[PDB]
Design a protein around this motif. Structure first.
Motif, mmCIF file in Angstrom:
data_model
loop_
_atom_site.group_PDB
_atom_site.id
_atom_site.type_symbol
_atom_site.label_atom_id
_atom_site.label_comp_id
_atom_site.label_asym_id
_atom_site.label_seq_id
_atom_site.Cartn_x
_atom_site.Cartn_y
_atom_site.Cartn_z
ATOM 1 N N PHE A 1 2.210 4.747 -24.048
ATOM 2 C CA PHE A 1 2.544 3.277 -24.069
ATOM 3 C C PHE A 1 4.022 3.029 -24.325
ATOM 4 O O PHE A 1 4.492 2.074 -23.723
ATOM 5 C CB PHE A 1 1.611 2.409 -25.006
ATOM 6 N N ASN B 1 0.831 -1.123 0.000
ATOM 7 C CA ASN B 1 0.000 0.000 0.000
ATOM 8 C C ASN B 1 0.916 1.239 0.000
ATOM 9 O O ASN B 1 1.868 1.438 0.796
ATOM 10 C CB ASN B 1 -0.949 0.039 1.225
ATOM 11 N N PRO C 1 9.756 22.472 -7.274
ATOM 12 C CA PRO C 1 10.992 23.135 -7.716
ATOM 13 C C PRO C 1 12.140 22.225 -7.708
ATOM 14 O O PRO C 1 13.049 22.474 -8.458
ATOM 15 C CB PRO C 1 11.098 24.299 -6.697
ATOM 16 N N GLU C 2 12.040 21.216 -6.810
ATOM 17 C CA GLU C 2 13.055 20.260 -6.438
ATOM 18 C C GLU C 2 13.278 19.373 -7.587
ATOM 19 O O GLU C 2 14.497 19.295 -7.919
ATOM 20 C CB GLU C 2 12.568 19.487 -5.154
ATOM 21 N N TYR D 1 8.309 -0.363 -17.160
ATOM 22 C CA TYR D 1 8.385 -1.715 -16.683
ATOM 23 C C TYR D 1 9.785 -2.259 -16.508
ATOM 24 O O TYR D 1 10.144 -2.846 -15.494
ATOM 25 C CB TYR D 1 7.578 -2.792 -17.498
ATOM 26 N N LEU E 1 12.379 19.828 -10.870
ATOM 27 C CA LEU E 1 12.716 20.744 -11.956
ATOM 28 C C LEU E 1 14.214 21.232 -11.833
ATOM 29 O O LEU E 1 14.818 21.402 -12.914
ATOM 30 C CB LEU E 1 11.775 21.975 -12.093
ATOM 31 N N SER E 2 14.839 21.368 -10.645
ATOM 32 C CA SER E 2 16.239 21.744 -10.516
ATOM 33 C C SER E 2 17.056 20.479 -10.728
ATOM 34 O O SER E 2 18.227 20.614 -11.061
ATOM 35 C CB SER E 2 16.560 22.304 -9.150
ATOM 36 N N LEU F 1 6.033 0.928 -21.080
ATOM 37 C CA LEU F 1 6.866 -0.150 -21.383
ATOM 38 C C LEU F 1 8.216 0.084 -20.941
ATOM 39 O O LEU F 1 8.874 -0.786 -20.346
ATOM 40 C CB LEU F 1 6.802 -0.488 -22.872
ATOM 41 N N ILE G 1 16.677 17.937 -12.897
ATOM 42 C CA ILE G 1 16.591 17.392 -14.220
ATOM 43 C C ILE G 1 16.687 15.875 -14.275
ATOM 44 O O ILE G 1 16.615 15.236 -13.255
ATOM 45 C CB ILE G 1 17.467 18.074 -15.279
#
Lengths: 89, 405, 54
Positions: free
Chosen positions: B286, B204, B255-256, B293, B258-259, B290, B261
């Motif tokens: 799709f 869970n 922001p974390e 996975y 996005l900084s 894949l 990358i």
């Protein structure tokens, strides 16, 4: 385990001196525990435990993915197969 | 501290035969270098067991299968010799220090710091049992509240090494007591992640998302896995839990992230998948699904058992989103967008509908896909009667028992 | 290291470039943080007209 919440009915009912006799009387009606036959016939059981891990031997929440295989492998083939037909149509 | 999980991560990937050929042979190199150098000698014997029926095996003292798909697996006798030597040596040194701390009073702080070092060695060699014992003496000598919390986390970490979810769970009850005794926000963040990873390890994910989206902002790491590793896990837990409006804020507009990358494969695939669920580019969904996975779900320890469940869910959501915006579709339009066949589409819908999250029927005869809507007052009535059915069952059940008394 | 040697209004420009970096990394949470620090170094009244235009 048993009907309803199995956890709600185990604590509702516990051993008293009155109760202990009735446990034996119930047991003895069919006779035994009825839980020695399965170990004898198979001479060590062989359950569904291979398929995955939400199977018969499970001790965590079920994922419900033992009634169906992984279709992701299948999908890898289905995706490519479509591309090739599509291309010359 | 550092090899203890990093060797286990690669060793799990190496075990599988349901990974790519390439990914298993890259992993295998990191594992092997680290056994020889770091003296991971007993866990290495342990790991020969853990394949068994899976391939790669090429060991000189432990079983081999007929198909060796790997050779960055070897048992050498030098490894065994080393063990014997190194063992006595470390043991002998510290012991004597402990006796010295006994002669001239200094034993409150320093003898516990000696026994911390003994459990780290024990832990290094892959013994959960004897690491824990030593880390037990550390407690008895009276030390700071900070030190006591740090120690319990270390013990719980040894639970992750052998991938025993219950061994993690039990120890983390005790930290919940001490956390507010020290009252630190520093070791509480560590707690949030420690728990993060534990909740991720079980089925869970509802709890996991909550702890791990926070763990992007402020993270403090003492024997806790890399920040790019923590980012990846957080994107998985976001997807599961949340729906569009919320989702878009949390894991695309952080922001974390996005900084930070993307530079590595794992982060990249997971990230692109998440934007495509929001942005209703279902074509490109799709190929990303894949990729997710192979590169994300399966090499991970805490998602190997939840990989099957996570992809199946994903297929359910994306088609269900589409359905919310439609009353009628056609079979071909729907199939084309996905990039599958109509025949194949009927087949995937036909596993998912009985259980139901889609809320759809298919008229095979008129050539439409029709969408039934039970959301009205009807929906809210069904919600209540069911929740009520349980209250009626419980009331009955306890009541017969007291009425008997 | 030049913040103990804080006396130069030529530190205005360094904060301004850090702001630009987070701007194209496309987070404006941190963009603002460095913008505040740019206005603080440029609160000194001895800054050129051109840096203030920046």
């Amino acid at each position: 385990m048993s009907t309803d919440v199995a956890a709600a009915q185990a604590q509702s009912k516990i051993d008293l001196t009155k109760k202990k006799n009735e446990e034996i009387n119930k047991k003895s009606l069919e006779e035994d525990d009825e839980f020695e036959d399965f170990p004898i016939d198979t001479w060590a059981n062989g359950e569904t435990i291979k398929s995955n891990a939400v199977t018969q031997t499970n001790i965590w929440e079920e994922n419900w993915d033992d009634v169906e295989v992984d279709d992701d492998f299948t999908n890898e083939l289905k995706a490519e197969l479509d591309r090739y037909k599509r291309e010359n149509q | 501290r550092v090899p203890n999980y990093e060797v286990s991560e690669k060793a799990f990937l190496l075990t599988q035969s349901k990974v790519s050929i390439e990914q298993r042979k890259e992993a295998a190199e990191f594992v092997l270098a680290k056994i020889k150098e770091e003296e991971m000698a007993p866990y290495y014997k342990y790991l020969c067991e853990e394949y068994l029926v899976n391939n790669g095996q090429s060991d000189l003292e432990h079983d081999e299968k007929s198909d060796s798909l790997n050779e960055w697996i070897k048992f050498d006798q030098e490894l065994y010799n080393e063990l014997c030597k190194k063992n006595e040596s470390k043991i002998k040194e510290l012991n004597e220090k402990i006796q010295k701390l006994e002669e001239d009073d200094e034993g409150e702080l320093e003898q516990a710091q000696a026994w911390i070092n003994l459990g780290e060695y024990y832990a290094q060699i892959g013994d959960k049992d004897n690491a824990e014992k030593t880390l037990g003496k550390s407690l008895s000598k009276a030390i700071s509240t900070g030190a006591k919390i740090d120690v319990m986390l270390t013990i719980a970490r040894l639970g992750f090494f052998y991938n025993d979810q219950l061994y993690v769970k039990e120890k983390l009850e005790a930290v919940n007591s001490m956390i507010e005794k020290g009252g630190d926000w520093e070791r509480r963040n560590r707690y949030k992640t420690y728990y993060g990873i534990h909740c991720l390890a079980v089925r869970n994910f509802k709890e996991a998302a909550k702890l791990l989206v926070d763990s992007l902002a402020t993270f403090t790491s003492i024997e806790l896995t890399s920040y790019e590793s923590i980012a990846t896990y957080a994107s998985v837990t976001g997807l599961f839990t949340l729906e569009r409006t919320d989702l878009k804020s949390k894991v695309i507009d952080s922001p974390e992230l996005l900084s930070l990358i993307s530079t590595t494969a794992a982060l990249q695939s997971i990230s692109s998948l998440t934007i495509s669920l929001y942005a209703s580019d279902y074509a490109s969904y799709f190929p990303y699904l894949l990729e997710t996975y192979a590169n994300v779900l399966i090499p991970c320890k805490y998602l190997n058992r939840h990989a099957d469940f996570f992809v199946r869910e994903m297929r359910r959501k994306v088609y269900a989103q589409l359905l919310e915006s439609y009353k009628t579709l056609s079979l071909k339009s729907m199939a084309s967008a996905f990039g599958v066949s109509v025949a194949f589409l009927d087949n995937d819908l036909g596993k998912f509908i009985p259980n139901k999250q889609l809320n759809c029927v298919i008229d095979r005869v008129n050539g439409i896909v029709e969408t039934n809507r039970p959301d009205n007052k009807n929906a809210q009535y069904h919600l209540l009667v069911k929740q009520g059915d349980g209250l009626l069952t419980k009331l009955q059940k306890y009541g017969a028992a007291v009425r008997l008394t | 290291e030049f913040k103990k040697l804080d006396d130069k209004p030529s530190l205005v420009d360094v904060h301004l470039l850090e702001s630009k970096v987070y701007h194209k990394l496309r987070n404006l949470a941190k963009s603002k943080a460095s913008l505040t620090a740019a206005r603080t170094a440029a609160n000194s009244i001895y800054c050129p007209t051109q840096t203030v235009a920046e």
